[PDB]
Paper text:
The crystal structure of Streptomyces sp. V2 L-aspartate N-hydroxylase outlines a characteristic helical domain wedged between two dinucleotide-binding domains. Together with NADPH and FAD, a cluster of conserved arginine residues forms the catalytic core at the domain interface. The Lineweaver-Burk plot of the initial rates revealed a pattern of lines intercepting on the horizontal axis, suggestive of a ternary complex mechanism. Thus, Streptomyces sp. V2 L-aspartate N-hydroxylase operates as a typical class B flavoenzyme monooxygenase: it is a single-component enzyme that binds simultaneously FAD and NADPH and retains the pyridine nucleotide coenzyme throughout the catalytic process.
The enzyme was originally crystallized in conditions where the sole precipitant in the reservoir solution was ammonium sulfate. Expectedly, the protein structure is populated with sulfate ions. Two of these sulfates were found juxtaposed to the FAD and embedded by an arginine-rich site, establishing H-bond interactions with Arg266, Arg409, Arg412, Asn413, and Arg416. Being negatively charged molecules, we speculated that these ions occupy the putative position of the substrate and therefore inhibit the protein. Consistently, we found that the enzyme loses 50% of its activity already at 5 mM SO42- and becomes completely inhibited at 10 mM concentration. Interestingly, this effect is specific for sulfate because chloride (up to 100 mM) and phosphate (up to 50 mM) salts did not affect the enzyme.
Residue numbers in the entry: 2 to 601
Amino acid sequence: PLSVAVVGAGPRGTSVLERLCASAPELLAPGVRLTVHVVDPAPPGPGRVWRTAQSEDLLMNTVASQVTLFTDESVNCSGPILAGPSLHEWADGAIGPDDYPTRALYGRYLEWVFARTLRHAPPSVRVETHRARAVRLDDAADGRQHLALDNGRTLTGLSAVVLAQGHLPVRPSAAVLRDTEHADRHALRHIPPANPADVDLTVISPGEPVLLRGLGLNFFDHMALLTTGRGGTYVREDGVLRYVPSGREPRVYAGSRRGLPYQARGDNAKGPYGRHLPEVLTPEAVSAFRKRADSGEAPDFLRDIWPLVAKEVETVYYTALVRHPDFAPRYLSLPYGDPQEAELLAEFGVDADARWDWERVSRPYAQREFAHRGEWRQWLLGYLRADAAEALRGNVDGPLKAALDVLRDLRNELRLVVDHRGLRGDSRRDHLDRWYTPLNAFLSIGPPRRRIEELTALLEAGVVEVLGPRLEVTREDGAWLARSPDVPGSAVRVTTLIEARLPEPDLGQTADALLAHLRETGQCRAHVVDGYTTGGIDVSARPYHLVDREGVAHPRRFAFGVPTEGVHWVTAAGARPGVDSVTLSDADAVARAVLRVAGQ
Ligand SMILES: Cc1cc2nc3c(=O)[nH]c(=O)nc-3n(C[C@H](O)[C@H](O)[C@H](O)COP(=O)(O)OP(=O)(O)OC[C@H]3O[C@@H](n4cnc5c(N)ncnc54)[C@H](O)[C@@H]3O)c2cc1C
Ligand SMILES: NC(=O)c1ccc[n+]([C@@H]2O[C@H](COP(=O)([O-])OP(=O)(O)OC[C@H]3O[C@@H](n4cnc5c(N)ncnc54)[C@H](OP(=O)(O)O)[C@@H]3O)[C@@H](O)[C@H]2O)c1
């Protein structure tokens, strides 16, 4: 009997399964029965990340109305549109449309979408689930696929295999290996990069000095598990929030190179579907860059693309500030940085000190010197109160927060520019990977306003201290010493060091047995751009055929999602409804390429 496999049953593998079911009526000759083998060690639909068993203190950073696993009439794909409830719609009042659902609520949704997909499967499709890890993929002698499972079963005679493996484990770095040995030598707790939901924090005693290294979204997970996750609660009084300790909290210290928590997402004022539509980095501009890349002279991010992005962000900021319909047409007609930008801003009455400054935005303390921890704390509380305030204004009327949400709304235009060798190698390395991606994340992939407010209250209550910029950490006899060179008197010896970040996809250092087998036998390879290696797994153009060390696109092997980071930009994001989501059209294209290779 005809047979294919999907490796991974998270949102992406679940979506491949739903799109297979959708197009199998059209693409399988009548009377043909296809078995789809779905393989995941975690219960299928949510997979590992979204599993319903995890702690309820952990949130999504997407509002509930903007999360789906269903196609809609806006999705440009060849498969049939099969409409279904968004997270919000399904949750039946459990969560508001502009509120952040718990990860377990998204799990309960994903669980239901898996079960529904099975119930609605056409007669031509039989689904077989496997509570196992796939560990080897090989060509059989005839060119069909053998997939070996860790439970001793082997799947043979496979027409196609889809790898939707998502957030894979990575070998500990050199730094993380030293810091873990140090914990072993002096009985300390080292927690290496991980989903915060996957870590055991119960070994951290009340009052323990802990360093959270990292101030992004992993940091806010840990912040919550070590406070509200231990009996802590908040109380709102005359608008302002207050933390009510349980007495079980550690003494939490945090820091990073930048020294700042990620910016609050402006409160959504764009409803479920609305966004800033591109007016500088436009489809027309993106076609011009694709053409230059295909004819072998790819653009430079910093010289060619950044100026278009900065112009959009600055334009939306000043449009929200001036609120005059004549303004934006005149500001858009000017090249980025032209002397007339200033003259026009002056004409519409914008003081030289409300002007935009990428230096203030990324390094808002940089004018300022800190005599001790207390000056740093007073400045930081000022900063976080101003961030919360700005986010309350929302992503339409709030000048700053609408401007920064542009960075979110340009993701698809930027994907189309940089993806599949769209940049010179040296630019991808020095401009995108090592500057823009992290800045972007700081500015536009931060937490809900609520979490900034909470952190503000936790600083006031003394439960959490943020150390300061350029976090230094040293192994010392019996502890780690953490300080900020920019904040005298911030030295503190901790006995728990938590790396508050996810492992970044790295094929080179993968801990997944299956990808390691494929790498070592030359059946996949790191995606390389002009001599820069990304450790994404290399794939072809949609529908993303796996590429081997010889440069051959495998007709029977597809890869889709986080492991392809480098080929694709910001793969760690879900599907949005009503905005021609590329996750859903990618899934449709993969499903039809699989059905086609099976029905010859
Ligand atoms: C902590 C965290 C929070 C996030 N929050 C958000 C958010 O709020 N909003 C958002 O849009 N995105 C969020 N994301 C991004 C996330 O990448 C996507 O939402 C989505 O989970 C990606 O789907 P996926 O199937 O590609 O990957 P995953 O969700 O990682 O699924 C991969 C699945 O494949 C399985 N698998 C891997 N290797 C094998 C193997 N060899 N054999 C069998 N099974 C295997 C795993 O067990 C897992 O179930 C978050 C990610 C993380 C880690
Ligand atoms: N709330 C949620 O839904 C949630 C939770 C977790 C993760 N996620 C998803 O996963 C992605 C990654 O999250 P993340 O927290 O790992 O990344 P992140 O949000 O970018 O936070 C990473 C932090 O680590 C710091 N950092 C990293 N390596 C460091 C080092 N060696 N030394 C010092 N500081 C270091 C970075 O700051 P500096 O660069 O300034 O040092 C930054 O402050 C998100 O973008 C999102 O898609 C979502």
